[PDB]
Enzyme design. Structure first.
Site, mmCIF file in Angstrom:
data_model
loop_
_atom_site.group_PDB
_atom_site.id
_atom_site.type_symbol
_atom_site.label_atom_id
_atom_site.label_comp_id
_atom_site.label_asym_id
_atom_site.label_seq_id
_atom_site.Cartn_x
_atom_site.Cartn_y
_atom_site.Cartn_z
ATOM 1 N N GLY B 29 12.703 -35.887 -70.168
ATOM 2 C CA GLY B 29 13.866 -35.828 -69.257
ATOM 3 C C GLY B 29 13.527 -35.212 -67.908
ATOM 4 N N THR B 30 14.490 -35.227 -66.976
ATOM 5 C CA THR B 30 14.372 -34.651 -65.606
ATOM 6 C C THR B 30 14.359 -33.121 -65.716
ATOM 7 O OG1 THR B 30 16.730 -34.600 -65.124
ATOM 8 C CG2 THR B 30 15.594 -36.648 -64.591
ATOM 9 N N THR B 31 13.938 -32.426 -64.657
ATOM 10 C CA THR B 31 13.834 -30.942 -64.614
ATOM 11 C C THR B 31 15.228 -30.342 -64.383
ATOM 12 O OG1 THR B 31 11.610 -31.203 -63.727
ATOM 13 C CG2 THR B 31 12.556 -28.993 -63.601
#
Ligand SMILES: [Cl-]
Ligand SMILES: [Cl-]
Ligand SMILES: [Mg+2]
Ligand SMILES: [Mg+2]
Lengths: 111, 243, 52, 241, 250, 225, 231, 195, 204, 117
Positions: B29-31
Site C-alpha cells: 500500500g501507499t505510505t
C-alpha cells in the site's frame, strides 16, 4: 392509557368528468378546538397523473401517501417505467391499507 | 506443510502464516504516517495520482471516528473502511452507556480485540491494513498503530506502507532533536516533508498530499483536515526541503 | 472378559425396551445406549397417546 | 495430514496445534518470575522497547484483572489482550452473580476450562499465551496459579515463564531447598521485590536499569504495578549491599 | 465467524475403525497409572501425583474428585479433559436426577450420563473425543458398592478391580492374583498401595500418592447434626499422614 | 412466624410448624427451616411451594459452586443468587426468606422479600406473625447476646407468633449456627400445643361398613412358568 | 494456485485471487464510458447481442431521479448492487427528506462488496459500475471495482478495450470539463470517446445506449431512434 | 428522605433509615446510601428491590469499567443509572441521587427521577419526605460551604423531613466524600429531634 | 369457573400399625350434573399409590404422565420407585408448571419396601409437600374430611380396624358434599398384599 | 474440495459454466416470435416405446398470456415454473392486471444465482 389515534378534521371531495377528474380538500388542520394550520395541503400529485388524499388522522394519512408514492417509484423500477393505471393504483392502495388490518390507518382515501 | 492455506492454524514455529501474508498486502500500500506533538497528533498520507482524470482533493482517505479520533491506513482500502465502521459502532456504544467520548487507549483495544478475533477462525480472513489512529482525551494526546495480527502499541511517531523505512528514519531524528517536544504547527510542516521524502519509494507516478490534526490549542481537541493556506504553506516547506 | 469383571451387575448385550420388547446389541455399546433411550421414550409416548 | 491443522488427535494421541501454541508463547522473547512473601505476592517481567518511535509507557504485559488479581502474560500481545479482556469480564460477572471477589485459583480454573474447549472444538484455535495469575487471597493467602494452551493449571510456591524459565526455576528451587519454607520470610513487599529482582539477575546473569524491568505487586485488597522511579529505588537498595 | 464445522470429525475408515477414538485411547495409554479395587465393605481408587515442577504445589491439583457424597472419580490421560468432565458430571447429577427425584443418582446411572457426554464428542459436529479413561467408585442403597470404567468411545464396564494408563497390563495381572470376594476395605487399601508402588519411579509417600475410599458413612464430615437419616458422605480422601501410617505396615 | 437472631459467636433462626389453606390448618407439623448448605440455613414464609423450590434450586447451584471453587459456600452468595432469581419473576414467586449462616467471612443474618430486596440486621422476623415476633425482639434484644440467651429470645419470639397469630401455631423449630462448629438443627425444640386425650374411642366394630365387592390387587410383575 | 480456492485465503505475496478473478469478469464485459462537466454527467454504453435474432443486453440502470450507473461483467450482480443503491437512495429520501450524496453512495457500495471478500462460503461481486449523479455539490462520476475500491473521476471507461477511451478523455480533459450548459456537445464528446474502443463493429441505432443527468435534467436513458441523432 | 450536597471539599450524602410496607416499618435501621465505586455513592428512594437491583448492575458496570479504562467520572456513573432507568421505565419505580468526588471535577451531584431523566445540580433532595423541606433547603443552601456547615444543613434538613413524613424516620446516616477519603456519620433521634 | 370444583371428588389416606389405607369417591360431574359413577381417582405405579382430586382432564393427564415417568425410572434404576422418592417427583413435576399449573390435589400412599415404614403425603396444585404422620385429605369435601379424620383417627390401628375408620371418614364427609359420592373405593395396603373394597353408599 | 461460488481465472463461475453443459445434453426446444404470435416447439424424446409420450410435459403454461418451453434437467424446472406461476398470479392480485413478459422473466432469473454454502 396512551391513545395512538387522533382527528385532524378537514374534508376531501373527488369528482370525475368525461375527460378530466378533480380532487379537492380544505387546507385547515385542527386538533380538538384549536387550529394547527390554515394551510397544510392534504391533496398530493403522486406521479403518472394520479392525485391522492388520505383524510382523518393526519399521521396515518401522511404515512399512507408516502408508502403509495414509494409504491409508484418501485413500479417504474421493476416494470421498465410502465405508467401505473388508476385501477392498478387503486388495487395497490387496498393492499397497503389491508396490511394494517389489525392496527388500521384511521383515514378515508380518495384518488 | 499446508499450515499457510487456513487462517488460525499454528505452524510448527507457532506462527499464523495467513496473518503474515496480510502484512504483505499492507507493505504493498501507499505510505501513511502519524506524529504525536506537544498537545495533540498529526496524520498524513500519500495519494497516488493514477491518471489526470482523478478529481483533485475529492478521493479523501483519512477518516474521522466520533469527533476527536483520526484514522489513516495502508493496504486494502475497503478493509480499512470496514475497520473504521466497526470503530464508529464501538465509539457510539461506549458514549451511549458511559456518556464521555471513548478514551484513545480504550478505543485502541476495541479495534485490537476485533482485528485479533479475525485470527481465531478459518471462516474469516485477517485484515489487510495497518491502521495509524489517535487523538486528544482527558489524559492528553495518544498516537497508536495497529497490525493485522491485532498487535498495537503507543508511539511518539508511526509509519506504514511502501515508504515506512524512509519515514521511520525521519521520525527517529525528530524524537532525538526535540526531547522537550514538537508544536502542532511544526508537526504539520514535518508531516508534509516526511511524506514527500517517503514518495521516493513511489516516484513513478506523481502524488497528492493529505494532512489532518487534533490539537488542544489549534483545533480545540477535535479532528480537522489541513486545507487552503496552511496546506500550501506545508507543501511549500516540503518542496523547499527536497530541493 | 476378565476374571475381575463384576458379571452379576454387568450389561453390554441384552437391554429391556419395555415389558414386551427386548434388544440384543452388536457394535459400539455407547452408540446403542443413545438409541435404546430414544426407543424407551417412543414406547412410553405411544402408551401415553393410545393407552396400548 | 490435516490432523496437524485442527485440534483432533494424531495416531500418537497428541494435539499438534496445542504443542505449536506453546511455541508461540516464547515469540516475544520475554521472561517472567513470580514469588510469595508473608503478606504479598510479587511478579517481575523483562521490558524490551526496541523502537525509539514507541511510547514506552504503553508497552506492558502485566494486567490489573480485578482490584485483587494481577495477570502477567508470556506470548504475543493480541492474544494477551484477548485473554486480559475475557478475565476482566469473567471476574466482574463472578462478583455480580455470587457477591464476593473471584478468587485467583477460581479465575485460573475458568480461563483453563475456556482453553480446554479450544483444544476439543475445531473451529476455535488455542491462544498462544501462558497466563500467570497473582493475588493475596482472603482464604488461601499469597497465591500463584498459572494457565497454558493445553487448559492445564496448578498452584505454585514460586514460578518462572519464557525462553530462560528453566534457569530461573532451578535458581528458585535451590533457595527453597535451603530455607525449607514455601515463601520469602520478609515483612515488607519492597524487600520481596528486591529478592525477586536479585534472583532474576543471578539466574539470567544480566544487570537491569529502571526501564528494563516491569513489576506487579499483590497485597491484601489491591494489586498494583510499580513506576520506573519506584523500580529505581529498588535497584539502588540492591546495589548498596 | 459462526461454527461452520457442523460435520463429524470422527468417521469410520474402510477397516471399520473409528480413528479419533483409537487415537484418544492412545493418549490414555501415555497417561499416569490409576486403579480401583472393590472390597466387601468399601471401594478404593488411587493414582500418582506426577508433579510437573517441585515449585508447583501438587496439593492444589486434585486427580481424585468427589462427584456426589457417595461417588468418587479418578482418571488416566489428558488432565484438562478430566477437569471439564468432572464439572459436567457434577452438574448432570443435579439437573438430570437430584432436581427431579430429590436424592443423588446411583453409581451406574451417573456413569451412564458421563458415558453419554463422551459418546456425543464422538459423533457431534466440529469436536474431537475426550482423551481420558475414568474409574468411578460409588455406593447406593439398592446396588451397594460398585466400580466402573468409562472410555473415550462412551463404553463403560463394571469391575471387581482394574487399572488404566501407563502400567495397566502389569497392574491388572497383580490384582487378579490378590483379589478375592472376602476382602475387607483395609485389605483392599494395602493391595492398592502394593500395586501402585510397581508403576511409580521416584518418591513414594503420602505427598506423591492420591488415594480416596467409598466406605462407611462419615457423620464427622456432614457439617450439621439433627437429622437421623442424614449420616454423612461415604466418599473420603485419605490425608498425607494416613497414607504414610499404612506404608509402615507395607 | 420465622425469626433470625445474631449472637456473639454465631446466628440462630427459628420458625413455627403450621401451614394453612384459607382458614384451614393443612399441616400441624410443617418444616419451614431449609438447608441451603451444611452451615447456611434459611426460614421461609409466603407460598409454601415457592419457598421450598427456591431454596432447593439455590442450594443445588450453591453446592455446584462450592465444588467448583473448592471453598465452603458464603451466605452473601446464596443471598445474591436468591434475590436475582426472585427479582427476575417480579414478586410472582412469593418467597419471603430469612437467610442465616456461618462461613469463613464470619456469621451473617439477612432477610429477602419476594420482589428481590434484601436487608441486614442483628434480629429479623417475617410472615403473618412477624409483628408479634418483632414486638418481643424490640423489647428483649441487646448487643453481645450469649448462645443460650439468643435461643431463648428466638423461641420466645416464635411463641408470641404461635399464641397471638392465627396463621402460626403448633411447635417451635430452631437451628443454631455457631462459628467453628457444626450447625445443630433442633426439630420440635418446644411442644407447647399437644392435643389432650379424647373422651371416647371411635374405633368401630368390624363389619360396620357395607361392602359391595372385594378383590385382590396385583402389585407383583408378570410371573414365571 | 493453492490460494485461489476461496476468498478467505491470502497468497504468500498478500494477494486475494478470487477478487482478482472477479476483476477479470469486468475486462470480458462490453465497453462503457463515463464523463462529466460542471453542469452535466454522461454515461455512454456499447450494448452486446448474442446473435442477429437476439436483443442487445441493457447496460444502464436508473437508481434515483438524480443518480444511476452503467455495468460491465455479471448483469445479475449489477441487478443486486443497483437494487441495494435504489434502497439506500430510497431510505435517505423517506427518513431524512435528503437526496443521497454520490460520494456516500460510493462509500456504501464499497462496504457491501468488502464483506463478500473477508467471509467463508460467499464470493466477490463479478461486475464493475460507473455511477453518475447531480447532488448539492454538482456533477459527479464514480468508478466501482468489486475489490471494494471506489474512485471519483472527471472521466473513465471499463470493459473490453476501455484503455482507448480512457486515453482520449485524458487528452480532452481540459475541453470537455468546460462544456457547461450544452448537453448535446457533452454526449458528442462521450460518443467520440467510446468510438476509440471499437474494432470491426461501429455504433448502430440498436447498439448505442446513452444516459445523462444535470442541473435541470433528471437521469434519463436514450435507446433506439433517440440516439440516431448522435450516430 | 435522601439528599446530596456539594461543598468546598467535596460532596455529602444524607438519608433516613426507614423502610415501610403500608404503615408497618419493615426495617428501622435501613442503609439507603450505597457504594457503586470507591468515591461514587448513590442515594436510593422508591422500590427497595428496584434500587438494589439497579445499584448492583451499576457497581458491576463500573467495576468492569475500572478494570479496562481506570476510575470512572461521576458523570459516567450517572449515565449508567440513567440508561437502566430510562430503557426500563415501564417496569421500574426508582428515584436515585448519584454523588461522587473527582480531583479534577471535585464534588458533583446528579438526580434521576422516575422518567429516567438526568439533572446535574449543586445539591439535590428526593423521597416522599423531600416535599416538606423544598422551602427550607432553597432558603438555607449556599455554595462552597465548610464540612461542619454542610453536615449541619443536612442534619437540620432531614430532621424536618423525618418529623412530617411517616415514611421517613430512624437514624440519619451520612457519607462524606473528599480527597481525604470516605467518612461515615450517624445521628440518633435524641440528637436531631431537639434541633 | 373455579377449575378445582367443576368435576368434584375426594381422596383420603391414613397410616396404621405396619399398613397404610387410601380411599376415594367415584363421581365425575359437570358442576350440578352427574356424568359418571365409575371415575376412580386412585392409581398405582408398582407398590406406590397416587390419589388425585380436581379438574378431571388433569387427573387423567397426570396419571398418564406419572405412569410414563415411573416406567422410565424402573427401566433405568432396575427397581420400583419408593413412596419418599415418588413424592419428590410429583412435587418437581407440579412446580415446573408454576405459572400455568395443573388444578389438582395429589395424595401419595405406600410402604417403603426396604424399611417397612408406612408413608403418606399430600400436595397443593404447585407441588408444596405436606408429610403428615396421621392422615392426608384432598378435594371438594376437604373441610369435612379434616373434621372426620381429626376425631375418628387414633395411631397404630390394625389393618381391619383402619379399614372401618377410613371408610366411615370418607362416607360421612362425601354425604355432606354435593359434588362427592356416587360410590367409594378403599385400598388396605400391607408390605406384600393389597385388598380393594367398593363401599355401599347413598347414590344422591 | 473447492467453493461452489468460486470464480475461474477467466472470471466465470465454475458451477454456472458446468450447468450450461447439462443443458447442451437436453432435448431440443425452438421459439419463433411474429407480429401474429409466438410459436414454441419441443422434441419429447421418449427413452422407450412403452413410455406413454403424452405424459412428457416440456411445454408449460405460466399464465394465459405467457407460455414456457424447457431443455436440460427438466425436474429442476418444476420449482422455477412454480415460482413463475406464483409471481404472475401475485402481481395480478397486487395490481389488477397482467404482468409484463420481461418482468416475469426477470423474476425467474433472480432465483438463478441464489446458490452457495
Ligand atoms: Cl467453567
Ligand atoms: Cl434497601
Ligand atoms: Mg481447534
Ligand atoms: Mg416520621
Amino acid at each position: 392509557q396512551f391513545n395512538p389515534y387522533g382527528d385532524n378534521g378537514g374534508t376531501i371531495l373527488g369528482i370525475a368528468g368525461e375527460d378530466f377528474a378533480v380532487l379537492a380538500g380544505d387546507t385547515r388542520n385542527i386538533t380538538d378546538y384549536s387550529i394547527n394550520s390554515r394551510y397544510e395541503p392534504k391533496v398530493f400529485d403522486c406521479g403518472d397523473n394520479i392525485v391522492m388524499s388520505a383524510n382523518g388522522f393526519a399521521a396515518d394519512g401522511d404515512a399512507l401517501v408516502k408508502r403509495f408514492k414509494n409504491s409508484v417509484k418501485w413500479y417504474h423500477f421493476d416494470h421498465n417505467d410502465k405508467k401505473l393505471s388508476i385501477n392498478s393504483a387503486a388495487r395497490n392502495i387496498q393492499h397497503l391499507l389491508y396490511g394494517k388490518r389489525f392496527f388500521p390507518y384511521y383515514v378515508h382515501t380518495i384518488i | 506443510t499446508g499450515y499457510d492455506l487456513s487462517n488460525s492454524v499454528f505452524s510448527p514455529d507457532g506462527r499464523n502464516f495467513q496473518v503474515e501474508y496480510a502484512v504483505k498486502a499492507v507493505e504493498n500500500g501507499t505510505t501513511s504516517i502519524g506524529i504525536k506533538c506537544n498537545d495533540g497528533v498529526v496524520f498524513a498520507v500519500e495519494k497516488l495520482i493514477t491518471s489526470k482524470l482523478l478529481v483533485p482533493q475529492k478521493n479523501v482517505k483519512i477518516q474521522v471516528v466520533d469527533r476527536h479520533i483520526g484514522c489513516v491506513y495502508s493496504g486494502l482500502i475497503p478493509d480499512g473502511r470496514h475497520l473504521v465502521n466497526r470503530g464508529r459502532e464501538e465509539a457510539a456504544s461506549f458514549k451511549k452507556l458511559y456518556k464521555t467520548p471513548i478514551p484513545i487507549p480504550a478505543f485502541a483495544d476495541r479495534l485490537g480485540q476485533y482485528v485479533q478475533a479475525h485470527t481465531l477462525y478459518n471462516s474469516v480472513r485477517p485484515f489487510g491494513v495497518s491502521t495509524i489512529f489517535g487523538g486528544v482525551d482527558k489524559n492528553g494526546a495518544h498516537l497508536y498503530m495497529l497490525e493485522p495480527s491485532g498487535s498495537y502499541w503507543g508511539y511518539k511517531g508511526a509509519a506504514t506502507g511502501k515508504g515506512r523505512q524512509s519515514a521511520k528514519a525521519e521520525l527517529e531524528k525528530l524524537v532525538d532533536h526535540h526531547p522537550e517536544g514538537l508544536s502542532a504547527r511544526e508537526a504539520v510542516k514535518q508531516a508534509a516533508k516526511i511524506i514527500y521524502l517517503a514518495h521516493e519509494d513511489n516516484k513513478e507516478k506523481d502524488f497528492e498530499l493529505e494532512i489532518s490534526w487534533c490539537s488542544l490549542s489549534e483545533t480545540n481537541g477535535l479532528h480537522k483536515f489541513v486545507k487552503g493556506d496552511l496546506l500550501q504553506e506545508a507543501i511549500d516547506f516540503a518542496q523547499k526541503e527536497i530541493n | 472378559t476378565s476374571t475381575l469383571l463384576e458379571q452379576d451387575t454387568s450389561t453390554e448385550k441384552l437391554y429391556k425396551l419395555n415389558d414386551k420388547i427386548a434388544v440384543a446389541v452388536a457394535g459400539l455399546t455407547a452408540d446403542a445406549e443413545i438409541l435404546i433411550n430414544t426407543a424407551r421414550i417412543h414406547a412410553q409416548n405411544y402408551l401415553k397417546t393410545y393407552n396400548e | 495430514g490435516y490432523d496437524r491443522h485442527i485440534t483432533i488427535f494424531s495416531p500418537e494421541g497428541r494435539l499438534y496445534q496445542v504443542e505449536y501454541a506453546f511455541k508461540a508463547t516464547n515469540q516475544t522473547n520475554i521472561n517472567s518470575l513470580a514469588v510469595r512473601g508473608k503478606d504479598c505476592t510479587v511478579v517481575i517481567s523483562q521490558k524490551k522497547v526496541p523502537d525509539k518511535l514507541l511510547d514506552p509507557t504503553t508497552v506492558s504485559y502485566i494486567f490489573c484483572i480485578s482490584r485483587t488479581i494481577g495477570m502477567v502474560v508470556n506470548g504475543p500481545i493480541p492474544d494477551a489482550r484477548n485473554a486480559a479482556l475475557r478475565a476482566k469480564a469473567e471476574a466482574a460477572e463472578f462478583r455480580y452473580k455470587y457477591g464476593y471477589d473471584m478468587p485467583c485459583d477460581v479465575l485460573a480454573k475458568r480461563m483453563a476450562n475456556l482453553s480446554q474447549i479450544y483444544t476439543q472444538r475445531a473451529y476455535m484455535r488455542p491462544l498462544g499465551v501462558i497466563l500467570t495469575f497473582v493475588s493475596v487471597d482472603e482464604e488461601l493467602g499469597p497465591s500463584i496459579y498459572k494457565t497454558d494452551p493445553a487448559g492445564y493449571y496448578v498452584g505454585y510456591k514460586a514460578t518462572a515463564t519464557g525462553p530462560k524459565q528453566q534457569e530461573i526455576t532451578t535458581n528458585l528451587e535451590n533457595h527453597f531447598k535451603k530455607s525449607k519454607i514455601d515463601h520469602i520470610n520478609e515483612e515488607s513487599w519492597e524487600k520481596v521485590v528486591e529478592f525477586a529482582i536479585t534472583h532474576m539477575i543471578d539466574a539470567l546473569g544480566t544487570e537491569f536499569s529502571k526501564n528494563d524491568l516491569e513489576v506487579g505487586v499483590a497485597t491484601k485488597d489491591k494489586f498494583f504495578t510499580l513506576s520506573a522511579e519506584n523500580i529505581e529505588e529498588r535497584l539502588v537498595a540492591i546495589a548498596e549491599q | 465467524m459462526t461454527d461452520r464445522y457442523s460435520f463429524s470429525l470422527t468417521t469410520f475408515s474402510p477397516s471399520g475403525k473409528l480413528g479419533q477414538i483409537d487415537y484418544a485411547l492412545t493418549a490414555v495409554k501415555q497417561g499416569v497409572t490409576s486403579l480401583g479395587i472393590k472390597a466387601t465393605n468399601g471401594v478404593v481408587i488411587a493414582t500418582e501425583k506426577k508433579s510437573s515442577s517441585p515449585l508447583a504445589m501438587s496439593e492444589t491439583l486434585s486427580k481424585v474428585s468427589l462427584l456426589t457424597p457417595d461417588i468418587g472419580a479418578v482418571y488416566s490421560g489428558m488432565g484438562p479433559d478430566y477437569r471439564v468432565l468432572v464439572d459436567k458430571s457434577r452438574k448432570v447429577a443435579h439437573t438430570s436426577y437430584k432436581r427431579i427425584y430429590g436424592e443423588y443418582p446411583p453409581t451406574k446411572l451417573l456413569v451412564s450420563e458421563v458415558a453419554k457426554i463422551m459418546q456425543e464428542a464422538t459423533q457431534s459436529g466440529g469436536v474431537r473425543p475426550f482423551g481420558v479413561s475414568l474409574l468411578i467408585a460409588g455406593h447406593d442403597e439398592f446396588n451397594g458398592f460398585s466400580l466402573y470404567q468409562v472410555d473415550p468411545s462412551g463404553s463403560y464396564f463394571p469391575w471387581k478391580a482394574t487399572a488404566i494408563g501407563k502400567g495397566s497390563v502389569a497392574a491388572k495381572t497383580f490384582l487378579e492374583k490378590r483379589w478375592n470376594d472376602e476382602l475387607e476395605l483395609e485389605d483392599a487399601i494395602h493391595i492398592a498401595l502394593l500395586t501402585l508402588k510397581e508403576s511409580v519411579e521416584g518418591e513414594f509417600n503420602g505427598d506423591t500418592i492420591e488415594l480416596a475410599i467409598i466406605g462407611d458413612e462419615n457423620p464427622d464430615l456432614l457439617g450439621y447434626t439433627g437429622i437421623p437419616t442424614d449420616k454423612g458422605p461415604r466418599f473420603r480422601k485419605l490425608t498425607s499422614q494416613e497414607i504414610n501410617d499404612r506404608l509402615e505396615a507395607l | 412466624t420465622i425469626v433470625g437472631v445474631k449472637f456473639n459467636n454465631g446466628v440462630v433462626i427459628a420458625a413455627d410448624t403450621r401451614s394453612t389453606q384459607g382458614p384451614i390448618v393443612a399441616d400441624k407439623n410443617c418444616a419451614k427451616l431449609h438447608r441451603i448448605s451444611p452451615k447456611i440455613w434459611c426460614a421461609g414464609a409466603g407460598t409454601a411451594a415457592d419457598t421450598e423450590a427456591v431454596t432447593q434450586l439455590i442450594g443445588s447451584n450453591i453446592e455446584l459452586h462450592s465444588l467448583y471453587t473448592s471453598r465452603e459456600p458464603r451466605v452473601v452468595s446464596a443471598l445474591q443468587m436468591l434475590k436475582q432469581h426472585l427479582f427476575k419473576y417480579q414478586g410472582h414467586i412469593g418467597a419471603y426468606l430469612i437467610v442465616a449462616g456461618v462461613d469463613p467471612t464470619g456469621s451473617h443474618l439477612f432477610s429477602i422479600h419476594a420482589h428481590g430486596s434484601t436487608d441486614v440486621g442483628y434480629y429479623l422476623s417475617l410472615g403473618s406473625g412477624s409483628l408479634a415476633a418483632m414486638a418481643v425482639l424490640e423489647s428483649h434484644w441487646k448487643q453481645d447476646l450469649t448462645k443460650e440467651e439468643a435461643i431463648k429470645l428466638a423461641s420466645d419470639a416464635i411463641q408470641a407468633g404461635i399464641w397471638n397469630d392465627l396463621g402460626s401455631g403448633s411447635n417451635v423449630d430452631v437451628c443454631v449456627m455457631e462459628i467453628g462448629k457444626d450447625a445443630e438443627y433442633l426439630r420440635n425444640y418446644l411442644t407447647p400445643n399437644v392435643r389432650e386425650e379424647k373422651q371416647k374411642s371411635y374405633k368401630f366394630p368390624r363389619g360396620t361398613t357395607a361392602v359391595l365387592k372385594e378383590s385382590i390387587v396385583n402389585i407383583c410383575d408378570i410371573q414365571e412358568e | 494456485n493453492n490460494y485461489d480456492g476461496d476468498t478467505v485465503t491470502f497468497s504468500p505475496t498478500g494477494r486475494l485471487f478470487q477478487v482478482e478473478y472477479a476483476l477479470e469478469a469486468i475486462k470480458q464485459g462490453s465497453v462503457t464510458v463515463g464523463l462529466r462537466s460542471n453542469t452535466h454527467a454522461v454515461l455512454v454504453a456499447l450494448k452486446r447481442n448474442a446473435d442477429e435474432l437476439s436483443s442487445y443486453q441493457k447496460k444502464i440502470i436508473k437508481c434515483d431521479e438524480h443518480m444511476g450507473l452503467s455495468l460491465a461483467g455479471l448483469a445479475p450482480d449489477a441487478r443486486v448492487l443497483s437494487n441495494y443503491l435504489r434502497q439506500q437512495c430510497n431510505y435517505s429520501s423517506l427518513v431524512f427528506n435528503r437526496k443521497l450524496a454520490v460520494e456516500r453512495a460510493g462509500h456504501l457500495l464499497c462496504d457491501k462488496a468488502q464483506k463478500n471478500t473477508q467471509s467463508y462460503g460467499g464470493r466477490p461481486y463479478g461486475v464493475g459500475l460507473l455511477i453518475i449523479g447531480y447532488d448539492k455539490s454538482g456533477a459527479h462520476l464514480l468508478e466501482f471495482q468489486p475489490s471494494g475500491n471506489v474512485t471519483e473521476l472527471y472521466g473513465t471507461a471499463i470493459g473490453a478495450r476501455s484503455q482507448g477511451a480512457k486515453t482520449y478523455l485524458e487528452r480532452t480533459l481540459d475541453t470537455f470539463i468546460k462544456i457547461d450548459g450544452n448537453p448535446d456537445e457533452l454526449i458528442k464528446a462521450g460518443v467520440e470517446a467510446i468510438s476509440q474502443s471499437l474494432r470491426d463493429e461501429s455504433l448502430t441505432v440498436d447498439n448505442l445506449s446513452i444516459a445523462i443527468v444535470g442541473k435541470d435534467t433528471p437521469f434519463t436513458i436514450y435507446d433506439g431512434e433517440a440516439v440516431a441523432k448522435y450516430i | 428522605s435522601i439528599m446530596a450536597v456539594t461543598f468546598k471539599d467535596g460532596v455529602i450524602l444524607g438519608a433516613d433509615s426507614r423502610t415501610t410496607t403500608g404503615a408497618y416499618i419493615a426495617n428501622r435501621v435501613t442503609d439507603k446510601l450505597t457504594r457503586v465505586h470507591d468515591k461514587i455513592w448513590c442515594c436510593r428512594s422508591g422500590s427497595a428491590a428496584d434500587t438494589q437491583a439497579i445499584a448492583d448492575i451499576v457497581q458491576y458496570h463500573l467495576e468492569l469499567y475500572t478494570s479496562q479504562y481506570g476510575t470512572p467520572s461521576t458523570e459516567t456513573a450517572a449515565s449508567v443509572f440513567k440508561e437502566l432507568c430510562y430503557e426500563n421505565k415501564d417496569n421500574l419505580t426508582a428515584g436515585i441521587i448519584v454523588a461522587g468526588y473527582d480531583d479534577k471535577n471535585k464534588g458533583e451531584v446528579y438526580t434521576i427521577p422516575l422518567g429516567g431523566s438526568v439533572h446535574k445540580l449543586p445539591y439535590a433532595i428526593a423521597g416522599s419526605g423531600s416535599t416538606f423541606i423544598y422551602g427550607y433547603c432553597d432558603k438555607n443552601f449556599r455554595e462552597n460551604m465548610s464540612k461542619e456547615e454542610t453536615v449541619d444543613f443536612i442534619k437540620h434538613s432531614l430532621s424536618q423531613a423525618i418529623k412530617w413524613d411517616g415514611s421517613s424516620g430512624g437514624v440519619i446516616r451520612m457519607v462524606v466524600l473528599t480527597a481525604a477519603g470516605v467518612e461515615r456519620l450517624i445521628f440518633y433521634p435524641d440528637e436531631y429531634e431537639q434541633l | 369457573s373455579d377449575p378445582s370444583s367443576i368435576n368434584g371428588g375426594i381422596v383420603v389416606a391414613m397410616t396404621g400399625k405396619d399398613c397404610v389405607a387410601i380411599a376415594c369417591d367415584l363421581r365425575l360431574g359437570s358442576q350440578s350434573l352427574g356424568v359418571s359413577n365409575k371415575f376412580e381417582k386412585i392409581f398405582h405405579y408398582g407398590h406406590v399409590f397416587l390419589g388425585i382430586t380436581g379438574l378431571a382432564t388433569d387427573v387423567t393427564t397426570l396419571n398418564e404422565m406419572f405412569r410414563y415417568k415411573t416406567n422410565l425410572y424402573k427401566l433405568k434404576e432396575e427397581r420400583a420407585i419408593e413412596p419418599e422418592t415418588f413424592t419428590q417427583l410429583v412435587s418437581s413435576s407440579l412446580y415446573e408448571r408454576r405459572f400455568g399449573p395443573y388444578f389438582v390435589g395429589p395424595v401419595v400412599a405406600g410402604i417403603n419396601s426396604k424399611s417397612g415404614k408406612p408413608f403418606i403425603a399430600g400436595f397443593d396444585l404447585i407441588g408444596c409437600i405436606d408429610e403428615a404422620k396421621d392422615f392426608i385429605v384432598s378435594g371438594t369435601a376437604s373441610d369435612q374430611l379434616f373434621g372426620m379424620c381429626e376425631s375418628l383417627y387414633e395411631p397404630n390401628l390394625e389393618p381391619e380396624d383402619l379399614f372401618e375408620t377410613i371408610s366411615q371418614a370418607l362416607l360421612n364427609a362425601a354425604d355432606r358434599d354435593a359434588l362427592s359420592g356416587w360410590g367409594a373405593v378403599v385400598y388396605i395396603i400391607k408390605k406384600d398384599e393389597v385388598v380393594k373394597r367398593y363401599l355401599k353408599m347413598r347414590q344422591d | 474440495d473447492r467453493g461452489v461460488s468460486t470464480f475461474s481465472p477467466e472470471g466465470r463461475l465454475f458451477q454456472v459454466e458446468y450447468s450450461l453443459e447439462a443443458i447442451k445434453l437436453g432435448s431440443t426446444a425452438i421459439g419463433i416470435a411474429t407480429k401474429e404470435g409466438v410459436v414454441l416447439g419441443v422434441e419429447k424424446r421418449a427413452t422407450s416405446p412403452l413410455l406413454e409420450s403424452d405424459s412428457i410435459e416440456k411445454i408449460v403454461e405460466i399464465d394465459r398470456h405467457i407460455g414456457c418451453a424447457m431443455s436440460g434437467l427438466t425436474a429442476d424446472a418444476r420449482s422455477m415454473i412454480e415460482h413463475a406461476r406464483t409471481a404472475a398470479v401475485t402481481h395480478n392480485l397486487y395490481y389488477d392486471e397482467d404482468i409484463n413478459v420481461e418482468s416475469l422473466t426477470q423474476s425467474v432469473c433472480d432465483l438463478a444465482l441464489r446458490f452457495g454454502e
